[PDB]
């Protein structure tokens, strides 16, 4: 199925624009975005693992896929977030939740399971692959929400509508390129 990330999108919006709300239509559009970008990255990462005869989709294949998919500097920004998340989780002496350990609002355990839907046969999925992908999906969502919230404040409105999402995407040439491809 296409999964629902709305709860976690809202948690990101609370960290980015604590004072700003978001409409139901806007949330549906963001949920489509997350699913679409997930599918593009996961498909490419799984392909990389298969063509290269790897037994596991790892953080290397996610990182490569991010560099093939995200346009311009956005890809390097996103790689840095994935790498940061993996590092935080690793240095986490933790009996905490996987997401909390990596510093993330998006659901690492769920995303690991969803990623397994793209792994053929015996191919496994690594925990760090799922941390890294989670972190990229969260970061992209934060980038859109930051920009759309700023468009809303510019229009003196207190919640994000689809028009603010359009303003956000249309005014950033990398996000515009990403969404046109997706």
């Amino acid at each position: 199925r296409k999964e629902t990330y709305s709860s976690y999108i809202y948690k990101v919006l609370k960290q980015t624009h604590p004072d700003t709300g978001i409409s139901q239509k806007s949330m549906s559009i963001l949920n489509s975005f997350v699913n679409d970008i997930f599918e593009r990255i996961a498909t490419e990462a799984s392909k990389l693992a298969a063509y290269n005869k790897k037994s596991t989709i790892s953080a290397r294949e996610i990182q490569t896929a991010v560099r093939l998919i995200l346009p311009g500097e956005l890809a390097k920004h996103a790689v840095s977030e994935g790498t940061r998340a993996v590092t935080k989780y690793s240095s986490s002496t933790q009996a905490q939740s996987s997401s909390a350990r990596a510093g993330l609002q998006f659901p690492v355990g769920r995303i690991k399971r969803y990623l397994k839907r793209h792994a053929t046969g015996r191919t496994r999925v690594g925990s760090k692959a799922a941390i890294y992908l989670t972190a990229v999906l969260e970061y992209l969502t934060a980038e859109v929400l930051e920009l759309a919230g700023n468009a809303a404040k510019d229009l003196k409105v207190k919640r994000i509508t689809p028009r603010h999402l359009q303003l956000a995407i249309r005014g950033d040439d990398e996000l515009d390129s990403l969404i046109r491809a997706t």
């Binding site: 709860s7 139901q24 806007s26 919640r159 509508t161």
Partner: peptide, 12 residues
């Protein structure tokens, strides 16, 4: 924003 009038708030 008349546009959005039938677009309810997302509620946590």
């Amino acid at each position: 924003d008349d546009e959005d009038e039938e677009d309810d708030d997302f509620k946590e």
